[PDB]
Write a protein that binds this ligand. Structure first.
Ligand SMILES: [Mg+2]
Ligand SMILES: [Mg+2]
Lengths: 65, 151, 78, 116
RNA sequence: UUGAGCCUUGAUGUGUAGGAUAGGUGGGAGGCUUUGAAGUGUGGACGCCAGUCUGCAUGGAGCCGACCUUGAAAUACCACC
RNA sequence: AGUACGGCCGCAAGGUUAAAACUCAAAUGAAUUGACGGGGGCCCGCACAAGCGGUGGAGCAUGUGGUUUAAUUCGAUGCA
Protein backbone atom coordinates (compact mmCIF):
# COMPACT_ATOMS: atom_id res chain seq x y z
CA UNK A 1 0.00 0.00 0.00
CA UNK A 2 2.14 2.92 1.20
CA UNK A 3 5.60 3.00 -0.37
CA UNK A 4 8.57 5.20 0.54
CA UNK A 5 11.03 6.19 -2.16
CA UNK A 6 14.25 6.89 -0.22
CA UNK A 7 16.65 9.13 -2.09
CA UNK A 8 17.05 7.59 -5.62
CA UNK A 9 14.26 5.50 -7.19
CA UNK A 10 12.48 7.06 -10.19
CA UNK A 11 10.71 3.69 -9.84
CA UNK A 12 7.71 3.47 -7.52
CA UNK A 13 6.49 -0.13 -7.65
CA UNK A 14 3.49 -0.57 -5.43
CA UNK A 15 1.94 -2.25 -8.44
CA UNK A 16 4.18 -4.99 -7.07
CA UNK A 17 1.71 -4.97 -4.18
CA UNK A 18 -0.24 -7.94 -5.41
CA UNK A 19 0.32 -9.66 -2.07
CA UNK A 20 -2.65 -7.58 -1.00
CA UNK A 21 -5.69 -8.61 -3.01
CA UNK A 22 -7.13 -5.17 -3.88
CA UNK A 23 -8.06 -6.08 -7.46
CA UNK A 24 -9.19 -9.65 -6.82
CA UNK A 25 -11.37 -8.57 -3.91
CA UNK A 26 -12.69 -5.41 -5.56
CA UNK A 27 -13.76 -7.50 -8.54
CA UNK A 28 -15.51 -9.91 -6.15
CA UNK A 29 -17.24 -7.81 -3.47
CA UNK A 30 -18.59 -5.71 -6.30
CA UNK A 31 -21.41 -8.19 -6.93
CA UNK A 32 -23.62 -10.44 -4.81
CA UNK A 33 -22.71 -13.94 -5.91
CA UNK A 34 -25.12 -16.18 -3.97
CA UNK A 35 -24.96 -18.00 -0.68
CA UNK A 36 -24.13 -21.13 -2.68
CA UNK A 37 -22.56 -20.09 -5.97
CA UNK A 38 -19.30 -19.62 -4.01
CA UNK A 39 -19.90 -23.08 -2.56
CA UNK A 40 -20.25 -24.47 -6.09
CA UNK A 41 -17.43 -22.25 -7.35
CA UNK A 42 -14.92 -23.41 -4.74
CA UNK A 43 -15.93 -27.04 -5.26
CA UNK A 44 -15.27 -26.57 -8.96
CA UNK A 45 -12.14 -24.58 -8.12
CA UNK A 46 -10.28 -27.45 -6.50
CA UNK A 47 -12.00 -30.39 -8.12
CA UNK A 48 -9.98 -29.08 -11.07
CA UNK A 49 -6.90 -28.36 -8.95
CA UNK A 50 -6.68 -31.90 -7.55
CA UNK A 51 -7.00 -33.34 -11.06
CA UNK A 52 -4.11 -31.12 -12.16
CA UNK A 53 -2.11 -32.78 -9.38
CA UNK A 54 -3.45 -36.17 -10.53
CA UNK A 55 -1.89 -35.29 -13.88
CA UNK A 56 1.34 -33.85 -12.49
CA UNK A 57 1.57 -37.07 -10.48
CA UNK A 58 1.73 -39.01 -13.76
CA UNK A 59 5.20 -37.89 -14.85
CA UNK A 60 6.14 -41.19 -16.55
CA UNK A 61 4.75 -40.03 -19.89
CA UNK A 62 5.67 -41.55 -23.25
CA UNK A 63 5.64 -39.89 -26.72
CA UNK A 64 9.33 -39.39 -27.40
CA UNK A 65 9.63 -35.61 -27.02
CA UNK B 1 -2.20 -14.11 -46.21
CA UNK B 2 -3.05 -17.22 -44.20
CA UNK B 3 -0.11 -19.54 -44.80
CA UNK B 4 3.07 -18.22 -46.34
CA UNK B 5 5.26 -15.14 -46.63
CA UNK B 6 4.89 -13.99 -50.22
CA UNK B 7 7.81 -12.90 -52.37
CA UNK B 8 8.57 -9.58 -54.01
CA UNK B 9 8.69 -8.55 -57.67
CA UNK B 10 11.75 -6.28 -57.32
CA UNK B 11 10.42 -3.75 -59.93
CA UNK B 12 12.48 -2.17 -62.74
CA UNK B 13 14.27 1.20 -62.51
CA UNK B 14 12.74 4.31 -64.04
CA UNK B 15 14.23 4.96 -67.52
CA UNK B 16 15.01 8.67 -67.37
CA UNK B 17 16.05 8.76 -63.70
CA UNK B 18 17.82 5.76 -62.24
CA UNK B 19 15.56 5.45 -59.19
CA UNK B 20 13.01 2.70 -58.64
CA UNK B 21 11.08 5.09 -56.39
CA UNK B 22 9.65 6.93 -59.39
CA UNK B 23 9.07 3.64 -61.22
CA UNK B 24 6.58 2.58 -58.55
CA UNK B 25 4.87 5.96 -58.90
CA UNK B 26 4.43 5.39 -62.64
CA UNK B 27 2.97 1.96 -61.86
CA UNK B 28 0.46 3.48 -59.45
CA UNK B 29 -0.64 6.18 -61.90
CA UNK B 30 -0.91 3.45 -64.53
CA UNK B 31 -4.38 2.58 -65.71
CA UNK B 32 -5.45 -0.15 -68.11
CA UNK B 33 -1.92 -1.42 -68.67
CA UNK B 34 -0.85 1.71 -70.60
CA UNK B 35 2.62 2.19 -69.17
CA UNK B 36 3.87 4.41 -71.98
CA UNK B 37 1.09 6.87 -71.18
CA UNK B 38 1.83 6.59 -67.45
CA UNK B 39 5.53 7.38 -67.81
CA UNK B 40 4.80 10.11 -70.36
CA UNK B 41 2.53 11.91 -67.90
CA UNK B 42 4.92 11.50 -64.97
CA UNK B 43 7.94 12.70 -66.96
CA UNK B 44 6.15 15.76 -68.33
CA UNK B 45 4.55 16.64 -64.99
CA UNK B 46 7.83 16.25 -63.11
CA UNK B 47 9.56 18.37 -65.74
CA UNK B 48 7.04 21.21 -65.50
CA UNK B 49 7.49 21.00 -61.74
CA UNK B 50 11.25 21.50 -62.12
CA UNK B 51 10.40 24.96 -63.49
CA UNK B 52 8.11 25.61 -60.49
CA UNK B 53 10.35 24.47 -57.62
CA UNK B 54 14.10 24.83 -58.18
CA UNK B 55 15.18 21.38 -57.03
CA UNK B 56 16.32 19.38 -60.02
CA UNK B 57 14.07 16.37 -60.58
CA UNK B 58 14.20 13.90 -57.69
CA UNK B 59 14.75 16.09 -54.64
CA UNK B 60 11.61 17.99 -55.62
CA UNK B 61 9.82 14.62 -55.72
CA UNK B 62 10.98 13.36 -52.33
CA UNK B 63 10.28 16.64 -50.52
CA UNK B 64 6.77 16.33 -51.91
CA UNK B 65 6.61 12.68 -50.86
CA UNK B 66 7.93 13.25 -47.34
CA UNK B 67 5.08 15.71 -46.78
CA UNK B 68 2.19 13.36 -47.65
CA UNK B 69 3.52 10.02 -46.42
CA UNK B 70 1.88 9.34 -43.04
CA UNK B 71 3.28 7.73 -39.90
CA UNK B 72 0.31 6.13 -38.09
CA UNK B 73 -3.08 4.92 -39.26
CA UNK B 74 -6.32 3.58 -37.79
CA UNK B 75 -7.48 0.07 -38.66
CA UNK B 76 -10.52 -1.84 -37.44
CA UNK B 77 -9.21 -3.98 -34.57
CA UNK B 78 -12.29 -5.11 -32.67
CA UNK B 79 -11.88 -7.49 -29.73
CA UNK B 80 -15.06 -8.04 -27.74
CA UNK B 81 -17.49 -7.28 -30.52
CA UNK B 82 -16.01 -3.79 -30.80
CA UNK B 83 -16.50 -1.02 -33.35
CA UNK B 84 -13.48 1.21 -32.77
CA UNK B 85 -10.41 1.81 -34.90
CA UNK B 86 -7.06 1.18 -33.22
CA UNK B 87 -4.34 3.64 -34.32
CA UNK B 88 -1.28 1.72 -35.45
CA UNK B 89 2.04 2.68 -36.99
CA UNK B 90 2.69 2.35 -40.72
CA UNK B 91 5.69 0.35 -41.91
CA UNK B 92 8.19 2.38 -43.97
CA UNK B 93 7.41 0.56 -47.23
CA UNK B 94 3.69 1.28 -46.98
CA UNK B 95 4.45 4.93 -46.18
CA UNK B 96 5.69 5.53 -49.73
CA UNK B 97 2.82 3.47 -51.16
CA UNK B 98 0.17 5.37 -49.21
CA UNK B 99 1.80 8.64 -50.26
CA UNK B 100 1.80 7.81 -53.97
CA UNK B 101 -1.78 6.53 -53.95
CA UNK B 102 -2.99 9.69 -52.20
CA UNK B 103 -1.14 11.98 -54.63
CA UNK B 104 -2.50 10.18 -57.69
CA UNK B 105 -6.05 10.04 -56.32
CA UNK B 106 -5.97 13.74 -55.47
CA UNK B 107 -4.53 14.48 -58.92
CA UNK B 108 -7.40 12.59 -60.55
CA UNK B 109 -9.55 15.04 -58.61
CA UNK B 110 -8.96 18.82 -58.87
CA UNK B 111 -9.81 18.73 -62.57
CA UNK B 112 -8.19 21.83 -64.05
CA UNK B 113 -6.34 20.81 -67.24
CA UNK B 114 -4.87 17.68 -68.79
CA UNK B 115 -3.39 15.05 -66.47
CA UNK B 116 0.05 16.59 -66.98
CA UNK B 117 -0.94 19.74 -65.09
CA UNK B 118 -3.15 18.06 -62.47
CA UNK B 119 -0.21 15.94 -61.37
CA UNK B 120 2.12 18.93 -61.59
CA UNK B 121 -0.08 21.06 -59.34
CA UNK B 122 -0.46 18.37 -56.69
CA UNK B 123 3.26 17.72 -56.22
CA UNK B 124 3.92 21.46 -55.99
CA UNK B 125 1.27 21.78 -53.26
CA UNK B 126 2.70 18.72 -51.52
CA UNK B 127 6.14 20.32 -51.72
CA UNK B 128 4.69 23.26 -49.76
CA UNK B 129 2.30 21.41 -47.40
CA UNK B 130 -0.88 22.58 -49.10
CA UNK B 131 -2.61 20.09 -51.41
CA UNK B 132 -5.41 17.57 -51.05
CA UNK B 133 -2.90 14.76 -50.53
CA UNK B 134 -1.21 16.54 -47.63
CA UNK B 135 -4.70 17.28 -46.33
CA UNK B 136 -5.51 13.56 -46.42
CA UNK B 137 -2.41 12.63 -44.44
CA UNK B 138 -3.59 15.13 -41.85
CA UNK B 139 -7.08 13.59 -41.79
CA UNK B 140 -5.71 10.13 -40.99
CA UNK B 141 -3.20 11.61 -38.54
CA UNK B 142 -6.13 13.40 -36.89
CA UNK B 143 -8.22 10.23 -36.90
CA UNK B 144 -5.43 8.36 -35.13
CA UNK B 145 -4.97 11.09 -32.52
CA UNK B 146 -8.69 10.98 -31.70
CA UNK B 147 -8.32 7.23 -31.17
CA UNK B 148 -5.02 7.31 -29.26
CA UNK B 149 -6.80 5.91 -26.19
CA UNK B 150 -6.96 2.47 -27.83
CA UNK B 151 -3.53 0.82 -27.96
CA UNK C 1 -28.82 39.14 -38.50
CA UNK C 2 -29.06 37.46 -35.12
CA UNK C 3 -27.90 33.96 -34.21
CA UNK C 4 -31.18 32.33 -35.30
CA UNK C 5 -31.24 33.80 -38.80
CA UNK C 6 -27.49 33.26 -38.98
CA UNK C 7 -27.96 29.54 -38.31
CA UNK C 8 -30.82 29.38 -40.81
CA UNK C 9 -28.64 30.99 -43.48
CA UNK C 10 -25.77 28.64 -42.66
CA UNK C 11 -28.07 25.65 -43.12
CA UNK C 12 -29.47 27.04 -46.38
CA UNK C 13 -25.94 27.64 -47.66
CA UNK C 14 -25.01 24.06 -46.79
CA UNK C 15 -28.06 22.75 -48.69
CA UNK C 16 -27.02 24.47 -51.91
CA UNK C 17 -26.21 22.56 -55.12
CA UNK C 18 -24.36 25.45 -56.72
CA UNK C 19 -21.35 27.29 -55.33
CA UNK C 20 -20.96 30.46 -53.32
CA UNK C 21 -18.36 33.05 -52.36
CA UNK C 22 -19.10 34.68 -49.00
CA UNK C 23 -17.27 37.71 -47.65
CA UNK C 24 -17.64 37.99 -43.90
CA UNK C 25 -15.91 39.03 -40.70
CA UNK C 26 -17.56 36.39 -38.49
CA UNK C 27 -14.86 33.75 -38.16
CA UNK C 28 -17.24 31.21 -36.63
CA UNK C 29 -19.90 31.66 -39.32
CA UNK C 30 -17.26 31.43 -42.04
CA UNK C 31 -15.71 28.35 -40.43
CA UNK C 32 -19.00 26.48 -40.16
CA UNK C 33 -19.53 26.61 -43.96
CA UNK C 34 -16.34 27.51 -45.84
CA UNK C 35 -14.61 24.91 -47.99
CA UNK C 36 -12.04 27.20 -49.66
CA UNK C 37 -10.34 30.09 -47.86
CA UNK C 38 -9.48 33.23 -49.83
CA UNK C 39 -7.60 35.41 -47.35
CA UNK C 40 -6.16 38.87 -47.98
CA UNK C 41 -2.80 39.97 -46.60
CA UNK C 42 -0.44 42.92 -46.83
CA UNK C 43 1.14 44.29 -50.02
CA UNK C 44 -1.90 43.18 -51.97
CA UNK C 45 -1.34 39.42 -51.88
CA UNK C 46 -4.48 37.30 -51.75
CA UNK C 47 -3.48 33.89 -50.42
CA UNK C 48 -5.80 31.15 -51.67
CA UNK C 49 -6.16 27.93 -49.67
CA UNK C 50 -8.37 24.98 -50.61
CA UNK C 51 -9.74 23.65 -47.34
CA UNK C 52 -11.67 24.83 -44.32
CA UNK C 53 -10.50 27.02 -41.46
CA UNK C 54 -9.36 24.10 -39.31
CA UNK C 55 -6.94 22.86 -41.95
CA UNK C 56 -6.00 26.46 -42.80
CA UNK C 57 -4.90 27.00 -39.21
CA UNK C 58 -3.17 23.62 -39.26
CA UNK C 59 -1.26 24.60 -42.41
CA UNK C 60 -0.21 27.85 -40.75
CA UNK C 61 0.95 25.91 -37.68
CA UNK C 62 2.82 23.50 -39.97
CA UNK C 63 4.63 26.45 -41.58
CA UNK C 64 4.31 29.19 -38.95
CA UNK C 65 6.16 32.22 -37.64
CA UNK C 66 7.24 32.83 -34.07
CA UNK C 67 5.24 35.63 -32.40
CA UNK C 68 1.85 36.44 -30.94
CA UNK C 69 1.04 40.12 -30.48
CA UNK C 70 -1.04 42.10 -32.96
CA UNK C 71 -2.30 45.32 -31.34
CA UNK C 72 -0.94 48.44 -29.67
CA UNK C 73 -4.11 50.11 -28.31
CA UNK C 74 -2.88 53.61 -28.89
CA UNK C 75 -5.25 56.10 -27.15
CA UNK C 76 -7.80 58.89 -27.43
CA UNK C 77 -7.13 61.55 -24.81
CA UNK C 78 -4.23 64.02 -24.92
CA UNK D 1 -2.16 31.49 -4.55
CA UNK D 2 -1.43 30.79 -0.86
CA UNK D 3 1.74 29.00 -2.06
CA UNK D 4 1.00 25.53 -0.72
CA UNK D 5 4.14 23.37 -0.72
CA UNK D 6 3.11 19.74 -0.06
CA UNK D 7 -0.08 18.50 -1.69
CA UNK D 8 -2.13 15.31 -1.94
CA UNK D 9 -3.31 13.85 -5.25
CA UNK D 10 -6.46 11.74 -5.01
CA UNK D 11 -7.06 9.26 -7.84
CA UNK D 12 -10.65 8.01 -8.03
CA UNK D 13 -10.40 5.26 -10.64
CA UNK D 14 -13.72 3.64 -11.48
CA UNK D 15 -14.56 1.20 -14.24
CA UNK D 16 -16.24 4.06 -16.13
CA UNK D 17 -14.27 7.19 -15.19
CA UNK D 18 -11.20 8.61 -13.46
CA UNK D 19 -11.28 11.65 -11.18
CA UNK D 20 -8.11 13.45 -10.11
CA UNK D 21 -8.16 15.87 -7.18
CA UNK D 22 -5.08 17.62 -5.81
CA UNK D 23 -5.82 18.85 -2.30
CA UNK D 24 -3.56 20.02 0.48
CA UNK D 25 -2.56 17.71 3.32
CA UNK D 26 -5.74 18.54 5.27
CA UNK D 27 -8.12 17.59 2.46
CA UNK D 28 -8.99 21.02 1.03
CA UNK D 29 -9.41 20.62 -2.72
CA UNK D 30 -7.32 22.98 -4.85
CA UNK D 31 -8.26 21.73 -8.31
CA UNK D 32 -9.75 18.72 -10.01
CA UNK D 33 -10.13 17.12 -13.42
CA UNK D 34 -11.94 14.09 -14.80
CA UNK D 35 -11.27 11.75 -17.69
CA UNK D 36 -14.89 12.04 -18.80
CA UNK D 37 -14.99 15.82 -18.71
CA UNK D 38 -11.59 16.14 -20.38
CA UNK D 39 -12.93 15.57 -23.89
CA UNK D 40 -13.28 11.78 -23.69
CA UNK D 41 -17.00 11.43 -22.94
CA UNK D 42 -18.02 7.99 -24.17
CA UNK D 43 -16.22 4.65 -24.28
CA UNK D 44 -12.81 6.35 -24.36
CA UNK D 45 -13.18 7.92 -20.91
CA UNK D 46 -12.68 4.47 -19.33
CA UNK D 47 -9.17 4.11 -20.74
CA UNK D 48 -5.72 4.53 -19.17
CA UNK D 49 -5.01 7.34 -21.63
CA UNK D 50 -8.07 9.42 -20.71
CA UNK D 51 -7.01 9.23 -17.07
CA UNK D 52 -3.50 10.30 -18.07
CA UNK D 53 -4.92 13.34 -19.86
CA UNK D 54 -7.08 14.18 -16.85
CA UNK D 55 -3.91 14.17 -14.76
CA UNK D 56 -2.25 16.62 -17.15
CA UNK D 57 -5.42 18.69 -17.06
CA UNK D 58 -5.32 18.58 -13.27
CA UNK D 59 -1.61 19.26 -12.93
CA UNK D 60 -2.55 22.30 -14.95
CA UNK D 61 -4.97 24.55 -13.04
CA UNK D 62 -3.03 23.93 -9.83
CA UNK D 63 0.22 25.51 -11.05
CA UNK D 64 -1.04 28.68 -9.34
CA UNK D 65 -0.14 27.05 -6.01
CA UNK D 66 3.47 26.03 -6.65
CA UNK D 67 3.10 22.49 -5.32
CA UNK D 68 6.41 20.61 -5.17
CA UNK D 69 5.70 17.29 -3.45
CA UNK D 70 2.65 15.06 -3.89
CA UNK D 71 1.34 12.36 -1.57
CA UNK D 72 -0.68 10.18 -3.96
CA UNK D 73 -3.77 8.27 -2.79
CA UNK D 74 -5.30 5.79 -5.23
CA UNK D 75 -8.84 4.51 -4.80
CA UNK D 76 -10.93 2.11 -6.84
CA UNK D 77 -10.50 -0.52 -9.52
CA UNK D 78 -9.82 1.21 -12.80
CA UNK D 79 -7.79 1.40 -15.98
CA UNK D 80 -6.34 4.76 -15.01
CA UNK D 81 -5.29 3.96 -11.46
CA UNK D 82 -1.71 3.49 -12.68
CA UNK D 83 -1.48 5.68 -15.80
CA UNK D 84 -2.17 8.66 -13.57
CA UNK D 85 0.86 8.66 -11.26
CA UNK D 86 3.07 8.55 -14.37
CA UNK D 87 1.33 11.67 -15.66
CA UNK D 88 1.62 13.30 -12.23
CA UNK D 89 5.34 12.53 -12.16
CA UNK D 90 5.80 13.72 -15.75
CA UNK D 91 4.24 17.07 -14.78
CA UNK D 92 7.20 18.05 -12.60
CA UNK D 93 5.76 16.78 -9.33
CA UNK D 94 7.87 14.90 -6.78
CA UNK D 95 5.81 11.90 -5.70
CA UNK D 96 6.50 11.70 -1.97
CA UNK D 97 4.69 8.36 -1.53
CA UNK D 98 1.82 6.36 -3.00
CA UNK D 99 -1.05 4.80 -1.05
CA UNK D 100 -3.95 2.62 -2.23
CA UNK D 101 -6.90 3.83 -0.14
CA UNK D 102 -9.49 1.51 -1.66
CA UNK D 103 -12.50 0.87 0.57
CA UNK D 104 -12.77 -2.86 1.28
CA UNK D 105 -15.66 -3.78 3.61
CA UNK D 106 -15.04 -6.45 6.21
CA UNK D 107 -18.06 -8.32 4.86
CA UNK D 108 -20.55 -5.50 5.26
CA UNK D 109 -23.29 -4.27 2.95
CA UNK D 110 -24.80 -6.60 0.36
CA UNK D 111 -23.71 -5.83 -3.22
CA UNK D 112 -26.12 -5.58 -6.16
CA UNK D 113 -27.24 -8.58 -8.16
CA UNK D 114 -25.07 -9.46 -11.15
CA UNK D 115 -26.24 -8.52 -14.62
CA UNK D 116 -27.26 -11.42 -16.81
C1' U E 1 -16.18 39.60 8.65
C1' U E 2 -17.83 42.76 5.30
C1' G E 3 -20.49 46.61 1.46
C1' A E 4 -20.70 51.94 0.28
C1' G E 5 -19.09 56.85 0.81
C1' C E 6 -15.63 60.63 2.43
C1' C E 7 -10.48 62.72 4.00
C1' U E 8 -5.43 61.72 3.78
C1' U E 9 -0.88 58.89 2.21
C1' G E 10 1.16 56.52 -1.66
C1' A E 11 1.22 54.58 -6.47
C1' U E 12 0.34 55.50 -10.93
C1' G E 13 -0.62 58.62 -17.17
C1' U E 14 4.19 53.92 -23.99
C1' G E 15 0.61 58.00 -29.29
C1' U E 16 4.28 60.68 -33.83
C1' A E 17 8.48 63.33 -33.58
C1' G E 18 12.85 63.59 -29.14
C1' G E 19 17.79 61.63 -25.69
C1' A E 20 12.82 58.53 -23.53
C1' U E 21 6.39 56.02 -20.75
C1' A E 22 5.83 63.34 -21.95
C1' G E 23 -1.67 63.89 -17.57
C1' G E 24 -3.03 69.36 -17.20
C1' U E 25 -2.05 74.25 -16.63
C1' G E 26 1.89 75.75 -13.24
C1' G E 27 5.45 79.40 -11.62
C1' G E 28 9.65 79.72 -10.76
C1' A E 29 14.54 79.16 -10.84
C1' G E 30 18.45 75.33 -10.55
C1' G E 31 17.68 72.25 -6.95
C1' C E 32 17.90 66.83 -5.68
C1' U E 33 20.96 63.50 -2.85
C1' U E 34 24.78 63.55 0.78
C1' U E 35 19.12 62.78 6.83
C1' G E 36 24.58 58.71 2.41
C1' A E 37 25.23 57.98 -3.55
C1' A E 38 24.70 58.70 -10.93
C1' G E 39 25.38 52.43 -9.44
C1' U E 40 26.18 46.32 -8.95
C1' G E 41 23.97 42.24 -6.67
C1' U E 42 18.79 41.18 -5.25
C1' G E 43 12.61 40.90 -4.25
C1' G E 44 7.84 42.20 -5.51
C1' A E 45 4.28 45.10 -8.53
C1' C E 46 2.83 47.55 -13.15
C1' G E 47 3.99 46.37 -17.82
C1' C E 48 0.41 49.94 -24.57
C1' C E 49 7.11 45.17 -23.36
C1' A E 50 10.04 50.11 -24.49
C1' G E 51 10.65 49.62 -19.82
C1' U E 52 10.09 53.40 -14.48
C1' C E 53 8.41 52.44 -9.53
C1' U E 54 9.95 49.67 -5.75
C1' G E 55 12.25 46.57 -0.11
C1' C E 56 17.17 45.81 0.84
C1' A E 57 23.29 45.38 1.19
C1' U E 58 29.21 47.76 1.28
C1' G E 59 30.36 51.43 -1.45
C1' G E 60 27.53 57.52 0.02
C1' A E 61 28.72 63.68 -3.73
C1' G E 62 26.55 62.62 -9.19
C1' C E 63 22.09 61.96 -11.85
C1' C E 64 18.06 65.79 -15.15
C1' G E 65 16.81 71.29 -16.40
C1' A E 66 19.07 75.04 -18.48
C1' C E 67 20.52 74.04 -25.05
C1' C E 68 16.33 73.27 -28.48
C1' U E 69 15.50 71.04 -34.78
C1' U E 70 8.82 68.25 -31.45
C1' G E 71 1.70 70.74 -31.31
C1' A E 72 3.89 70.87 -25.03
C1' A E 73 8.36 70.48 -21.32
C1' A E 74 11.67 68.20 -18.34
C1' U E 75 8.47 63.83 -10.91
C1' A E 76 12.80 70.17 -9.64
C1' C E 77 7.68 70.44 -3.68
C1' C E 78 3.02 71.73 -1.45
C1' A E 79 -1.28 72.41 -4.42
C1' C E 80 -6.94 72.70 -4.84
C1' C E 81 -6.28 68.81 -9.34
C1' A F 1 -52.65 -36.38 -11.97
C1' G F 2 -49.94 -35.78 -6.91
C1' U F 3 -55.17 -33.41 -10.02
C1' A F 4 -60.67 -33.80 -8.67
C1' C F 5 -64.12 -35.34 -4.55
C1' G F 6 -64.28 -36.27 0.61
C1' G F 7 -61.63 -36.07 5.36
C1' C F 8 -57.85 -33.84 8.65
C1' C F 9 -54.51 -29.60 9.48
C1' G F 10 -53.83 -23.95 8.45
C1' C F 11 -55.50 -17.00 9.49
C1' A F 12 -54.54 -17.53 4.49
C1' A F 13 -51.39 -19.10 0.93
C1' G F 14 -52.12 -23.96 0.97
C1' G F 15 -50.27 -28.84 3.09
C1' U F 16 -51.16 -34.03 3.59
C1' U F 17 -54.12 -38.55 2.34
C1' A F 18 -55.62 -39.56 -2.50
C1' A F 19 -58.82 -41.63 -7.31
C1' A F 20 -61.63 -42.41 -11.83
C1' A F 21 -63.51 -41.78 -16.65
C1' C F 22 -60.89 -41.12 -20.90
C1' U F 23 -56.58 -41.72 -24.03
C1' C F 24 -51.48 -43.59 -26.46
C1' A F 25 -48.32 -47.75 -27.89
C1' A F 26 -45.37 -46.25 -26.01
C1' A F 27 -43.03 -42.92 -22.12
C1' U F 28 -38.11 -44.04 -19.94
C1' G F 29 -32.52 -45.05 -18.38
C1' A F 30 -27.43 -45.65 -19.95
C1' A F 31 -24.31 -45.87 -23.74
C1' U F 32 -23.01 -45.73 -29.46
C1' U F 33 -22.33 -43.43 -34.51
C1' G F 34 -23.32 -39.12 -36.62
C1' A F 35 -25.24 -34.19 -37.23
C1' C F 36 -25.66 -29.58 -35.01
C1' G F 37 -24.31 -25.45 -31.15
C1' G F 38 -25.04 -17.68 -30.93
C1' G F 39 -19.34 -24.53 -27.12
C1' G F 40 -13.62 -24.94 -26.88
C1' G F 41 -8.71 -25.93 -29.62
C1' C F 42 -5.70 -26.19 -34.16
C1' C F 43 -5.47 -25.44 -39.54
C1' C F 44 -6.84 -23.91 -44.20
C1' G F 45 -8.82 -20.68 -48.99
C1' C F 46 -9.42 -14.36 -52.75
C1' A F 47 -13.10 -16.17 -46.61
C1' C F 48 -11.96 -11.76 -44.55
C1' A F 49 -8.07 -7.87 -44.18
C1' A F 50 -4.53 -4.81 -47.94
C1' G F 51 -5.64 -3.31 -53.18
C1' C F 52 -7.18 -3.01 -58.35
C1' G F 53 -11.37 -3.38 -61.40
C1' G F 54 -16.48 -3.99 -61.81
C1' U F 55 -22.40 -5.04 -61.19
C1' G F 56 -26.83 -2.40 -58.98
C1' G F 57 -28.17 3.85 -62.17
C1' A F 58 -28.29 4.73 -68.70
C1' G F 59 -28.82 2.67 -73.74
C1' C F 60 -28.71 -1.81 -76.33
C1' A F 61 -27.70 -7.57 -76.66
C1' U F 62 -29.27 -12.18 -74.46
C1' G F 63 -31.81 -15.50 -71.18
C1' U F 64 -35.72 -16.01 -67.48
C1' G F 65 -40.34 -14.76 -64.65
C1' G F 66 -44.93 -12.68 -65.47
C1' U F 67 -48.43 -10.93 -68.62
C1' U F 68 -50.50 -11.41 -73.40
C1' U F 69 -51.43 -14.66 -77.60
C1' A F 70 -54.34 -19.06 -82.26
C1' A F 71 -49.65 -20.36 -80.47
C1' U F 72 -46.02 -17.42 -77.87
C1' U F 73 -43.18 -25.65 -78.38
C1' C F 74 -40.55 -28.20 -74.46
C1' G F 75 -37.00 -28.53 -70.67
C1' A F 76 -33.33 -26.13 -66.73
C1' U F 77 -35.45 -23.08 -60.61
C1' G F 78 -30.96 -21.09 -54.34
C1' C F 79 -25.51 -21.88 -54.14
C1' A F 80 -25.31 -26.28 -58.11
MG1 LIG G 1 -53.51 -31.33 -3.44
MG1 LIG H 1 -58.56 -31.94 -0.29
Amino acid sequence: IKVRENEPFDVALRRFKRSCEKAGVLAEVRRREFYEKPTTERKRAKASAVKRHAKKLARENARRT
Amino acid sequence: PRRRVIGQRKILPDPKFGSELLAKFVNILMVDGKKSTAESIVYSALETLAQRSGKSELEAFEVALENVRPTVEVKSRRVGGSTYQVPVEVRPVRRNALAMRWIVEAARKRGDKSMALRLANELSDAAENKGTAVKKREDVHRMAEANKAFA
Amino acid sequence: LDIETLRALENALLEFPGCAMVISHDRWFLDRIATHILDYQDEGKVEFFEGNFTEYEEYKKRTLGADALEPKRIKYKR
Amino acid sequence: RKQVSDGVAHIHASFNNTIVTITDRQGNALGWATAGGSGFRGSRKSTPFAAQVAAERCADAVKEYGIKNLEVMVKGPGPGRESTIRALNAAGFRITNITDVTPIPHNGCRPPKKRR
